């Protein structure tokens, strides 16, 4: 089997991407944030505290003839931005882009933190990291991809995120028309449960490539590119007036600037992030200070190849017995 679904930016900055997902019988379609940095499929629901729902579409398990309470199971997750959610668990039929999994754990939120409530465009998350990170207790549950894997034509999914435009998540096949040149594959460590890999270096604009190993994760659920402070300083030093602002929470730059590109290495290959992808717009409405799309990872504990980096590439998440990642230009 295969599946193919379009993923759409939630706003004009590509702060996140939503993909329609069919849950239950008859189908209830929710727009979920596909997140290769986590491993829970959770949704706003009829069980979510009413004061914490503000415009999201909810899953109502009582209206699904295929929903079954997973008795005793609870979940609770905290994300790297400080947001969180928790609740109980049903199993139900879940379809993405024509690919159907029966018995998928659908984690129904009883509580969500304010940032979820405040984002009316995201109805939940669909985790695509390794199932060892799934938070369901006492019986850990499998991701959608893990459940689908054996049925897929090939044990892979691909992320093709757009810049200020829709893109595609494919399951079970590699669309050879969606990228240019060849796909360069690189080793993955699953030891932390992430799609963790080692970039071979970077360049700023037209500058020379610096060969240096940068361990990090391919994370569709993180907006920006978070890299070591040395690398980030070298980038922003090329932008007149750019500075790190403690009050804003990262590097800012004059909105009048033209940003240089940023290149990262994948083995001997190179992925170029155009400068425009690094512009996240005014820090507040009407400001002439703009927020940078490349930020330091120094406070995180891990480097994160988020959407800023991934949307410059066609990315293969290869879930073969030994997982690997593939990157192609496009």
Beta-strand segment tally: 24
Oligomer status: monomer
Largest sheet: 7 strands, mixed
The CATH superfamily of the largest domain bears the name: Acid Proteases
Question: What is the count of helical runs?
Answer: 4
The shape, in one word, is globular
CATH topology of the largest domain: Cathepsin D, subunit A, domain 1
Structural class: mainly beta
Keywords: Aspartyl protease, Disulfide bond, Hydrolase, Protease, Signal, Zymogen
Domain Peptidase A1: 17-328
Family: Belongs to the peptidase A1 family.
Disulfide bonds: 255-290
Write the layout of secondary structure elements.
Blueprint: E1 3-9, E2 17-23, E3 28-35, E4 41-43, E5 68-78, E6 84-96, E7 99-112, H1 114-118, E8 124-127, H2 144-148, E9 156-160, E10 167-171, E11 184-187, E12 196-204, E13 210-218, E14 225-227, H3 229-236, E15 243-245, E16 250-254, E17 262-266, E18 269-273, E19 279-282, E20 289-292, E21 294-296, E22 303-305, H4 307-310, E23 314-318, E24 324-328
Domain Peptidase A1: 17-328
Active site: 35, 199
Keywords: Aspartyl protease, Disulfide bond, Hydrolase, Protease, Signal, Zymogen
Explained architecture:
The chain is 7% helix and 44% strand. The chain is mainly beta. It folds into 2 domains: 5-174, Beta Barrel (Cathepsin D, subunit A, domain 1); 175-330, Acid Proteases (Cathepsin D, subunit A, domain 1). The protein has a 7-stranded mixed β-sheet. Strands 2-3-8-4-7-6 form a 6-stranded mixed barrel. The chain has a 4-stranded antiparallel β-sheet with strand order 15-16-20-19, with no helix packed on it. It starts with a strand and ends with a strand. The PDB classes it as hydrolase.
